[PDB]
């Protein structure tokens, strides 16, 4: 396989606090975590560097490895392909870093079908009303999108109860509380990443 | 029918500028536009008032008028129903106001099936790259959600070319330019709303 710390799959409804928890996790563990570099077929832009911003490849090569099952997520628009390869995730693992995969539910099931063996964590709000208060606070939603988000979050919370889907489900009632649970769930992989 | 100004249906990819255009439209035309008040079956919260924040009704009543085809959009979570009724839209029209319907593509087709006769306007970015620059600027997206938004916006731009779907398609290259086109498209309904 690929030796190194197991990746972490982070999922949950938008606005529940998984970004706030992740930012604190990174700021308190520099050199421990990493993010996979995406593949694309579009042209590089000023300042971009291969292997850091993207892996720049041809459409023929990218399509070949999509068919080979490498890509846990991929999309296409304006004739250019984009995606995240399991090989790019293993490349972070090879550097003795915990690769962080912040994905929705469809991404979880795509990762479940690969040879990757990550830890699956769901960050859920304590209630739909708290999530509504959270979403109304950031002032990003119409009435249509706010209600659509709350309804979609309900199905997200319900699918989180599916047996074996997630290793850890964190209810973000208190942030300091939720963050401590996140660290404890990752404590063994953090220790492995702390090795040379 | 219901006499008064025709409602306006505003659609387009998130981040293309339809909220910025709408805010300027409201701030330069007070008393001219209005927003429909939604129906819900949930309990009122502190400070909320019937007929202003929501129309509070029973589940039996709301289900009856959903089956009657009143609701251009509706959703349910935690045992409570939410939705926008064509009657609430006509109630804004009855006050000689232009009712603003800011909805996605599915909302457009739901409105198309009612007795409402609004003006259908699509606000599109000049390119997907401009939209990406716009989305990256507001710092709300993961890499997964950013690419998903760009791909979804491509299908949104493509469906905007569907014959007869939209009365006006506004390409938001320059904001002052796009806003002037928005005012001109609504100039006759604004004049009607300016009548007593
Ligand atoms: N721990 C928390 N307590 C209260 N509100 C929160 C918390 N975390 C997030 N929010 C609200 O949710 C919004 C976005 O949450 P975020 O941290 O991005 O979670 P996610 O990554 O799941 O969207 C924030 O603007 C804030 O208003
Ligand atoms: N006219 C514009 N020119 C440049 N950037 C814009 C413009 N309108 C919107 N944006 C970018 O898009 C983001 C949100 O756009 P918004 O006005 O909410 O459009 P929408 O309502 O379609 O989401 C803004 O934070 C801004 O970065």
């Amino acid at each position: 396989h690929m030796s190194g710390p197991r990746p972490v799959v982070l999922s949950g409804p938008s606005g529940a606090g998984k970004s706030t928890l992740l930012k604190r996790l990174l700021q308190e563990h520099s050199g421990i975590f990493g993010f996979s570099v995406s593949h694309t077929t579009r042209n590089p832009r000023p300042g971009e560097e291969n292997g850091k911003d993207y892996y720049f490849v041809t459409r023929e090569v990218m399509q070949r490895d999509i068919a080979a099952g490498d890509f846990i997520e991929h999309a296409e628009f304006s004739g250019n392909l984009y995606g995240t390869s399991k090989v790019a995730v293993q490349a972070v693992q090879a550097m003795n870093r915990i690769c962080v995969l912040d994905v929705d539910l469809q991404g979880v099931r795509n990762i479940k079908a690969t040879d990757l063996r990550p830890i699956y964590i769901s960050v859920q709000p304590p209630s739909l009303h708290v999530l509504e208060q959270r979403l109304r606070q950031r002032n990003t939603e119409t009435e249509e999108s706010l209600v659509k988000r709350l309804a979609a979050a309900q199905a997200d919370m319900e699918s989180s109860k599916e047996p074996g889907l997630f290793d850890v489900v964190i209810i973000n009632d208190s942030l300091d509380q939720a963050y401590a649970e996140l660290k404890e769930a990752l404590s063994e992989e953090i220790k492995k990443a702390q090795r040379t």
Side-chain angles (χ1 to χ4, degrees), chain A residues 2-22 24-59 61-105 107-116 118-196:
Chain A
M2 182 51 93
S3 65
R6 284 161 65 170
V8 59
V9 172
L10 226 46
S11 196
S14 180
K18 78 175 163 283
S19 188
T20 308
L21 293 175
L22 175 59
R24 178 172 177 182
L25 196 60
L26 299 182
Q27 293 184 351
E28 299 187 352
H29 302 88
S30 65
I32 298 300
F33 298 87
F35 295 88
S36 57
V37 175
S38 299
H39 283 71
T40 190
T41 64
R42 77 147 160 80
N43 286 316
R45 291 169 182 176
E48 293 183 340
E49 305 172 35
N50 184 80
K52 163 162 173 180
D53 301 275
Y54 304 88
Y55 303 104
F56 297 99
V57 300
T58 63
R59 183 179 68 186
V61 164
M62 176 138 194
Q63 286 176 349
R64 174 195 72 187
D65 294 340
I66 288 170
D70 276 8
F71 282 85
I72 62 184
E73 254 157 27
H74 54 89
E76 162 164 358
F77 49 89
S78 290
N80 299 313
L81 281 65
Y82 307 83
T84 298
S85 168
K86 84 191 191 60
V87 185
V89 172
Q90 287 175 319
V92 176
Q93 184 180 33
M95 304 299 304
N96 206 41
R97 287 181 182 250
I98 301 166
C99 189
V100 176
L101 290 160
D102 188 351
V103 293
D104 64 20
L105 217 59
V108 178
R109 314 192 185 276
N110 282 15
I111 298 168
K112 289 269 184 170
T114 73
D115 59 309
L116 297 173
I119 302 172
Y120 297 92
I121 307 180
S122 179
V123 186
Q124 302 288 341
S127 73
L128 283 191
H129 186 202
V130 168
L131 179 68
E132 173 186 4
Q133 297 213 291
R134 290 193 189 151
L135 284 178
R136 293 189 174 277
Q137 186 180 255
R138 57 177 209 191
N139 211 14
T140 62
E141 310 298 322
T142 66
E143 295 319 71
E144 189 202 54
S145 73
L146 174 72
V147 173
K148 283 204 252 64
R149 281 188 176 279
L150 293 173
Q154 170 181 74
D156 196 319
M157 289 149 97
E158 189 56 37
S159 300
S160 86
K161 314 210 157 240
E162 163 176 322
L165 184 54
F166 290 103
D167 300 299
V168 187
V169 174
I170 301 180
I171 309 290
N172 185 19
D173 193 353
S174 153
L175 181 93
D176 292 352
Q177 186 43 207
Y179 176 67
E181 290 182 6
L182 180 56
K183 286 202 312 173
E184 295 194 5
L186 298 175
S187 66
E188 181 47 67
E189 308 302 324
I190 291 169
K191 178 173 302 196
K192 205 278 163 213
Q194 289 169 155
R195 313 280 193 181
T196 65

